């Protein structure tokens, strides 16, 4: 037979592993000749493994590439103008990479060009909070110092924005053993630490969901018009560079001025990690200076973009996609989940071969360019919007499959989590210790959630990659898995290689299998059964559980509430009326050989996500449109609920006019109370 | 049988007269007790005469009424402050209604309050271009002076626009007998002229599709967050008020200053038509003074909104909507409409009562609150938007009936020019010396298309009726349909009534019955035909038409064109696809038992209209989101093509910075480009 069993058993481990070595041999660096070439391999061999249809779609948007002939570094310099300490050119390569070519140096993505020079303030993680504790509680300044931030916790084009925002003229991202050193494990190539000498790529945009910096709202075609580099979306104000903790300890070592705040301050190097600003006594007349000369180049990015046509609903579409391209050879990421991705076309095209269809359309796409901001998903869903408005029934990302090997990690929208309990409980748990049992059961164990005993985690999107467009833009229902720790030391660096992956994380490839079969499953599932496999009583729950907790955070000022009357009933009884329109739909749902009746339902089902998204966006983010969800304003990454409540609550005893403030918040209250209410009623029968 | 013709055989002139009479006896002005009143009427009747549901939608919208102890006025007041003439403070009220209570004064709805003095400046119909001619040619400065402008050519709301942008203090709106009073023709009550007394009420806002002006966006709902009236949109700056030819007369007689330039400057009354600035010598020390002490008011408004259950596909919803306030009785404008709408509700109703549904649901509004800015249908669009996006086949407009008794008079998206073609043909022409002939016989010979012989003219969609929010901002097909002259004189007038319809427009209610069956048989087909009535390939025709009409606009300048390398070639190439894939697309739809290709396809052909939509809309006209047509910003009632690149070429040689204004045509020719594209795009194979 040809069932989710057949597909499931045609998965190989082997394969993910053969495929993975097979991509991860030279860099394949976006708008590289590299990454065109293997667009091309894997075109081909979609169309091999049995696709009706396999397109590249291209588009030509801007890019930022260091300068091969003047290169990117820091100094200190001294009173003369002398440069007595350089950061790295490279990192050291890895063992059997030292003559491999065109490993792009560390740089950080869209820095502006610039040699500023001054005093040093250490800033800790650069969050929103970082810099408040320094300029309300510290009283220092950041105005026209370099400041130096560790990455970790939150997005570093966070970072930027909020080190830009504070006044600072540069700024420096370094990797903290604290952060990036595991205790007991050793440094590549002997385990899967980061040395000395590693460093972090990584983009530094702002872009809130907008693409191409300069084409936001339509797809960067042969005849876009361009915003000027002025107008562009995203760019950072001042020049930013990331350095590895040797380099990162010549810096902070002769850090003098005020002392940490306190322990959370404090990373692992042996250093006092003071604030600064400048550096002390003795050394109190030297600078630190950076040099940047990268360029913005407006570069080709090619997607792949295969398609398995619907037996019976070819104008419903599923989508499973994942980027392509990398910083430098992309063993994790993101070439372990592109591994996954292949073999997933492969088993659904031996089906295929077969004679077997699935009921719905499956779109596979390879993006391009998203390490530079989601801009190869993005130009593409910009391209073809309408078409996934109005047939999208759902996006699986696949990004790294492994980012450790503890446990699987699920993020995706409530309407999913059904389709996810169900699905773990049929595949066997790959875990030590838990051989003959499910993944359901080693993940619920390993991952309990916070709320619900016997049920694992499972968390909200944010952002941060290529399900971005889908879910907070268009609102189409978004899922993502993978293998996860108890995010990785070598995150971006050189060192991430096919070695690390093979000695080091999964050198059995079952986890990576079965994160396939996770992804592969929800596919299938999603693609093939007769009724949509969304719940929409899930999304219920967690609304007033989103209600309850944006209210706890408005009663932390009850007299405000008191003075400019802010209420939150209309949004728990739009919550209220969501339960309970939900749960008449679900009786339907179980209860109605109606083909049309059955659509019509299953139009409801697709149209459910779609309805959270409001035309007009979040306040000043005009690409993040869902109502219940959006990244967070602190922290692409992360996901906030209620997020224009959120936002307009946030920090609000700072603002001058609270009258203005608490206004705003009610504002958002009515937007969330109607959004709700209208998303219910789609649920409603529907004459 | 229940076919179309047992649908059309059912409607009866006699009954659209009875519910004509029963529905303008008294004032049904928008928030007033007697409109809640006819509304609850409507309700009862709907259910009465077979519907599934009937309920009541109510807003809370912001209305404009006069003070009824503080009435508006004008003065000529002289030296001393002396008001030695004063304009009437009601409309003499026609034979048998002197007694009728609440009839409203003339006013202009949204004015604020004021009492400003100054100098007369006559600015024709205050158009643009009389603007330009004024400050460009004549060198006249409106600032600081009071406005006096004929009513005519364009939108009311419109001229107070440009007369606030030309600085002017206060504006005087009159009905010149040039364009109110035919020749030959006898003033109310003894022919359908305007006496001179009679005076046009209406609203002057600016409000570009944003419904009630405090809630833009969002239902004006019971917990609805309101802007303040500072941040309102769409509200005048400078006070406003109508008057009739008699009192125009005296303001206009002693008018000096420059001469009119030329004869397009002069009405039919016995004055010069000066100019001004001011009055001539004897009269130079005396002045113009507007009182006006109007409020705005947030007022409860209900639209009757019935639902016809579809047997087949009830979540697909076919519209038939027109408004049920008036300014006074309403005679034709709208209750000639809203009778009509009676009678076909009653009709639907006679054939649901023996067992007939129609294949589609059917929904019927009496929208609330047009008058004041198409308030009733948009706030109820802006409640129901996901449903109407995702559902929503077509709206089928049903204002005035009658405006004349010549011909009829079509206006509607290309994707229903077929259908009204085809109906036309089926049913009788009404017309004197066309018996026994078509109504597309009568219809084509007396108004012929400019383009086609031996076809009909259809005009494009603009604004200024309930339709808007439906077309212009969510995109669903759109058409009306109704019986012109070769508007009217009595328009908004307390002479609008019964008699005069009766009397003296259409003694036989033959061209209502004649309107009821053209806006009738086009729901029947849209919400009965196994495909839907539409042909994408008539879209492709008038898509050609528009390129080539904004390219010979831009074509004034070729210097520019080839200065900033300004190319329509990809406008002209989506053009060509779109042509070769509608092609294609109609060629399967004739060409392929299977409901789900059928669906699939009718899918196809709903979304197409709605694939024209810019989720970003137009520039700075965020709820006009349509592409290819959106109300001219010169004049609200006319409709534009290419309106994004329309704006951006006109009156370009005036910009005082060309490559930016040459860069923006730019930016909207690839905007249009791509839209057209992607609307082809949706007529592909689905994968
Ligand atoms: C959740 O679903 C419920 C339906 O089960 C829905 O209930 C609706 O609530 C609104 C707002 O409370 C009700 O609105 C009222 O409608 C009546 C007419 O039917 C009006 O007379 C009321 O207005 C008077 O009272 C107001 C409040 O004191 C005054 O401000 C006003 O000036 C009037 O005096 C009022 O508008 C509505 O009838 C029900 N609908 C039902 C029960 O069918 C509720 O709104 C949904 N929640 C959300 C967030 O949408
Ligand atoms: C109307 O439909 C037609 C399809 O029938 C569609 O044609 C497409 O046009 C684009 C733009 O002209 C073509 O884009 C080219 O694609 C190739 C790869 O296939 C590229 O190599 C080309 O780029 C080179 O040449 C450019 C122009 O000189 C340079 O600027 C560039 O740097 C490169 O050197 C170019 O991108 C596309 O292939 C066709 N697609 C087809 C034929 O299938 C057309 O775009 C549609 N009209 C609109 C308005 O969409
Ligand atoms: C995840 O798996 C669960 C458990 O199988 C699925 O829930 C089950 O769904 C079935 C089919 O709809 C339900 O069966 C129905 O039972 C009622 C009797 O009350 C009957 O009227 C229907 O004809 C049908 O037999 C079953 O009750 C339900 N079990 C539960 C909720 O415990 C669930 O749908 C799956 N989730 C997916 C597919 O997204
Ligand atoms: C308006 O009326 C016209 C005239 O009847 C309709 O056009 C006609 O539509 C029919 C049905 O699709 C076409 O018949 C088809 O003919 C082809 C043979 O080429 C065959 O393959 C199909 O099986 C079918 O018989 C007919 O050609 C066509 N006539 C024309 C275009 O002159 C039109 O569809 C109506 N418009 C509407 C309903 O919106
Ligand atoms: C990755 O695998 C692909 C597919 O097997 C390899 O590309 C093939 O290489 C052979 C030998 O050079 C050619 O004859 C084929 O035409 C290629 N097939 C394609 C591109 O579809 C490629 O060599 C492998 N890369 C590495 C580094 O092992
Ligand atoms: C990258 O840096 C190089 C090396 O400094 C730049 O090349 C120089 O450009 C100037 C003109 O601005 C020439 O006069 C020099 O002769 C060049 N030097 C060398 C060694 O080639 C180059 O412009 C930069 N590339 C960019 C900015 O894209
Ligand atoms: C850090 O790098 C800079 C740039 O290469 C070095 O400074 C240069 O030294 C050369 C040779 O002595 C001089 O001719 C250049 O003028 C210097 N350039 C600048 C910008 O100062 C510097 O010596 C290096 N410092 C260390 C400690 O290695
Ligand atoms: C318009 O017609 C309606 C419907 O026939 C009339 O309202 C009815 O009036 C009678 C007698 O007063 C009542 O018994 C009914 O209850 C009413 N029916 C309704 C409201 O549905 C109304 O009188 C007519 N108006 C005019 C001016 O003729
Ligand atoms: C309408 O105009 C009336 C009449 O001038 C206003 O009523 C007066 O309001 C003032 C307070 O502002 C009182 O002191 C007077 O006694 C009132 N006069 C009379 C004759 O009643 C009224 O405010 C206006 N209504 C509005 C603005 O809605
Ligand atoms: C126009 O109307 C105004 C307002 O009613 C009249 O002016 C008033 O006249 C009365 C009685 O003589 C005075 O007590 C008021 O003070 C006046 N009001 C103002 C605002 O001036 C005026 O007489 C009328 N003019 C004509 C020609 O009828
Ligand atoms: O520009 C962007 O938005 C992201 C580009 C790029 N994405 P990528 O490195 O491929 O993946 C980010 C890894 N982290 C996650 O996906 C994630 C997201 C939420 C919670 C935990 C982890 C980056 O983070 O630099
Ligand atoms: O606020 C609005 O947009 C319009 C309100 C109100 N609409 P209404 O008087 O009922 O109908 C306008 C009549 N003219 C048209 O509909 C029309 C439209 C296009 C071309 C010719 C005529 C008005 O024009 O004052
Ligand atoms: C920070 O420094 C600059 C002076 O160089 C000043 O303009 C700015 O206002 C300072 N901010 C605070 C909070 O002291
Ligand atoms: C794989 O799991 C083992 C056992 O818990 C652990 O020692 C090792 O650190 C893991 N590898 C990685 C890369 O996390
Ligand atoms: C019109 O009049 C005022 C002077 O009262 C002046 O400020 C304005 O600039 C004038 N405009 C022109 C074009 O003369
Ligand atoms: C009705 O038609 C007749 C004949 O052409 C004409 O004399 C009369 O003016 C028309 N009535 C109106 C209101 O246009
Ligand atoms: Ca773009
Ligand atoms: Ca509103
Ligand atoms: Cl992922
Ligand atoms: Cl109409
Ligand atoms: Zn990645
Ligand atoms: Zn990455
Ligand atoms: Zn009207
Ligand atoms: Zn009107």
Same mark, same amino acid.
């Given at each position: 037979?040809?069932?989710?069993?057949?597909?499931?058993?045609?998965?190989?481990?082997?394969?993910?592993?053969?495929?993975?070595?097979?991509?991860?041999?030279?860099?394949?660096?976006?708008?590289?000749?590299?990454?065109?070439?293997?667009?091309?391999?894997?075109?081909?061999?979609?169309?091999?493994?049995?696709?009706?249809?396999?397109?590249?779609?291209?588009?030509?948007?801007?890019?930022?590439?260091?300068?091969?002939?003047?290169?990117?570094?820091?100094?200190?310099?001294?009173?003369?103008?002398?440069?007595?300490?350089?950061?790295?050119?490279?990192?050291?390569?890895?063992?059997?990479?030292?003559?491999?070519?065109?490993?792009?140096?560390?740089?950080?993505?869209?820095?502006?060009?610039?040699?500023?020079?001054?005093?040093?303030?250490?800033?800790?993680?650069?969050?929103?909070?970082?810099?408040?504790?320094?300029?309300?509680?510290?009283?220092?300044?950041?105005?026209?110092?370099?400041?130096?931030?560790?990455?970790?916790?939150?997005?570093?084009?966070?970072?930027?924005?909020?080190?830009?925002?504070?006044?600072?003229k540069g700024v420096i991202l370094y990797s903290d053993p604290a952060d990036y050193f595991a205790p007991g494990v050793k440094s590549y190539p002997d385990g899967w630490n980061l040395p000395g000498g590693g460093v972090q790529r990584g983009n530094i945009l702002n872009l809130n969901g907008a693409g191409d910096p300069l084409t936001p709202g339509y797809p960067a075609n042969e005849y876009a018009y361009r915003r000027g580099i002025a107008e562009a979306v995203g760019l950072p104000s001042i020049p930013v560079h990331p350095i590895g903790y040797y380099d990162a300890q010549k810096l902070l070592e002769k850090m003098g001025g005020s002392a940490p705040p306190d322990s959370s301050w404090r990373g692992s190097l042996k250093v006092p990690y003071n604030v600064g600003p400048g550096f002390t006594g003795n050394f109190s007349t030297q600078k630190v200076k950076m040099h940047i000369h990268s360029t913005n180049e407006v570069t080709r990015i090619y997607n792949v973009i295969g398609t398995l046509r619907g037996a019976v609903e070819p104008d419903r579409y599923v989508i499973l996609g994942g980027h392509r391209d990398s910083w430098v050879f992309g063993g994790i990421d993101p070439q372990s989940g592109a591994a996954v991705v292949h073999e997933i076309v492969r088993s659904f095209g031996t089906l295929k071969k077969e004679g077997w269809r699935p009921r719905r359309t499956i779109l596979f796409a390879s993006w391009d360019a998203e390490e530079f901001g989601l801009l190869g998903s993005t130009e593409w869903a910009e391209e073809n919007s309408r078409l996934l408005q109005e047939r999208g029934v759902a996006?699986?990302?696949?990004?790294?499959?492994?980012?450790?090997?503890?446990?699987?990690?699920?993020?995706?929208?409530?309407?999913?989590?059904?389709?996810?309990?169900?699905?773990?409980?049929?595949?066997?748990?790959?875990?030590?210790?838990?051989?003959?049992?499910?993944?359901?059961?080693?993940?619920?164990?390993?991952?309990?959630?916070?709320?619900?005993?016997?049920?694992?985690?499972?968390?909200?999107?944010?952002?941060?990659?290529?399900?971005?467009?889908?879910?907070?833009?268009?609102?189409?229902?978004?899922?993502?898995?993978?293998?996860?720790?108890?995010?990785?030391?070598?995150?971006?660096?050189?060192? =991430?290689?096919?070695?690390?992956?093979?000695?080091?994380?999964?050198?059995?490839?079952?986890?990576?299998?079965?994160?396939?079969?996770?992804?592969?499953?929800?596919?299938?599932?999603?693609?093939?059964?007769?009724?949509?496999?969304?719940?929409?009583?899930?999304?219920?729950?967690?609304?007033?559980?989103?209600?309850?907790?944006?209210?706890?955070?408005?009663?932390?000022?009850?007299? =405000?509430?008191?003075?400019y009357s802010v209420s939150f009933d209309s949004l728990f009884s739009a919550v209220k009326n969501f339960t309970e329109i939900a749960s008449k739909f679900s009786e339907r749902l179980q209860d109605f050989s109606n083909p049309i009746v059955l659509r019509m339902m299953n139009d409801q089902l697709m149209f459910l996500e779609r309805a959270f998204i409001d035309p007009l966006g979040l306040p000043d983010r005009p690409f993040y449109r869902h109502v219940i969800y959006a990244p967070s304003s602190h922290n692409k990454y992360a996901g906030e609920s209620f997020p224009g409540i959120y936002d307009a609550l946030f920090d609000i005893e700072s603002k001058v006019d609270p009258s203005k403030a608490w206004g705003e918040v009610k504002r958002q209250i009515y937007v969330a109370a109607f959004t709700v209410q209208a998303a219910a009623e789609t649920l409603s029968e529907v004459a």
């Amino acid at each position: 037979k040809h069932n989710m069993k057949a597909f499931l058993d045609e998965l190989k481990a082997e394969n993910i592993k053969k495929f993975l070595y097979n991509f991860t041999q030279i860099p394949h660096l976006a708008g590289t000749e590299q990454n065109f070439q293997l667009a091309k391999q894997i075109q081909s061999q979609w169309k091999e493994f049995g696709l009706d249809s396999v397109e590249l779609a291209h588009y030509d948007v801007l890019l930022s590439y260091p300068n091969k002939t003047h290169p990117n570094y820091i100094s200190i310099i001294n009173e003369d103008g002398n440069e007595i300490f350089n950061t790295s050119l490279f990192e050291p390569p890895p063992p059997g990479y030292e003559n491999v070519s065109d490993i792009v140096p560390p740089f950080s993505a869209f820095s502006p060009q610039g040699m500023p020079e001054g005093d040093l303030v250490y800033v800790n993680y650069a969050r929103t909070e970082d810099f408040f504790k320094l300029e309300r509680d510290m009283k220092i300044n950041c105005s026209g110092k370099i400041v130096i931030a560790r990455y970790g916790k939150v997005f570093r084009g966070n970072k930027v924005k909020n080190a830009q925002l504070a006044g600072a003229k540069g700024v420096i991202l370094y990797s903290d053993p604290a952060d990036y050193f595991a205790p007991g494990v050793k440094s590549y190539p002997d385990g899967w630490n980061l040395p000395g000498g590693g460093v972090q790529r990584g983009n530094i945009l702002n872009l809130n969901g907008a693409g191409d910096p300069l084409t936001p709202g339509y797809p960067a075609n042969e005849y876009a018009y361009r915003r000027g580099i002025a107008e562009a979306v995203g760019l950072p104000s001042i020049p930013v560079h990331p350095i590895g903790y040797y380099d990162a300890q010549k810096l902070l070592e002769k850090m003098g001025g005020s002392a940490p705040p306190d322990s959370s301050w404090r990373g692992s190097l042996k250093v006092p990690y003071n604030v600064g600003p400048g550096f002390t006594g003795n050394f109190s007349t030297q600078k630190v200076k950076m040099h940047i000369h990268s360029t913005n180049e407006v570069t080709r990015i090619y997607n792949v973009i295969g398609t398995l046509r619907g037996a019976v609903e070819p104008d419903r579409y599923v989508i499973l996609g994942g980027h392509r391209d990398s910083w430098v050879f992309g063993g994790i990421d993101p070439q372990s989940g592109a591994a996954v991705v292949h073999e997933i076309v492969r088993s659904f095209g031996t089906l295929k071969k077969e004679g077997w269809r699935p009921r719905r359309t499956i779109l596979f796409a390879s993006w391009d360019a998203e390490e530079f901001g989601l801009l190869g998903s993005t130009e593409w869903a910009e391209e073809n919007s309408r078409l996934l408005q109005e047939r999208g029934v759902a996006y699986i990302n696949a990004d790294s499959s492994i980012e450790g090997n503890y446990t699987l990690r699920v993020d995706c929208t409530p309407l999913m989590y059904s389709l996810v309990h169900n699905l773990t409980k049929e595949l066997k748990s790959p875990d030590e210790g838990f051989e003959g049992k499910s993944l359901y059961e080693s993940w619920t164990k390993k991952s309990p959630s916070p709320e619900f005993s016997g049920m694992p985690r499972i968390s909200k999107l944010g952002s941060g990659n290529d399900f971005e467009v889908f879910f907070q833009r268009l609102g189409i229902a978004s899922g993502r898995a993978r293998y996860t720790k108890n995010g990785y030391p070598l995150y971006h660096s050189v060192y =991430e290689t096919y070695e690390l992956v093979e000695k080091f994380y999964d050198p059995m490839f079952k986890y990576h299998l079965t994160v396939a079969q996770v992804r592969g499953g929800m596919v299938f599932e999603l693609a093939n059964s007769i009724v949509l496999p969304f719940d929409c009583r899930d999304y219920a729950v967690v609304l007033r559980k989103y209600a309850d907790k944006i209210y706890s955070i408005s009663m932390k000022h009850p007299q =405000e509430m008191k003075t400019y009357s802010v209420s939150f009933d209309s949004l728990f009884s739009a919550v209220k009326n969501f339960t309970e329109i939900a749960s008449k739909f679900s009786e339907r749902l179980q209860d109605f050989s109606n083909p049309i009746v059955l659509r019509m339902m299953n139009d409801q089902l697709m149209f459910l996500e779609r309805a959270f998204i409001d035309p007009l966006g979040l306040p000043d983010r005009p690409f993040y449109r869902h109502v219940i969800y959006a990244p967070s304003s602190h922290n692409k990454y992360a996901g906030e609920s209620f997020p224009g409540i959120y936002d307009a609550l946030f920090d609000i005893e700072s603002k001058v006019d609270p009258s203005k403030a608490w206004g705003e918040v009610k504002r958002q209250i009515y937007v969330a109370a109607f959004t709700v209410q209208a998303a219910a009623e789609t649920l409603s029968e529907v004459a």
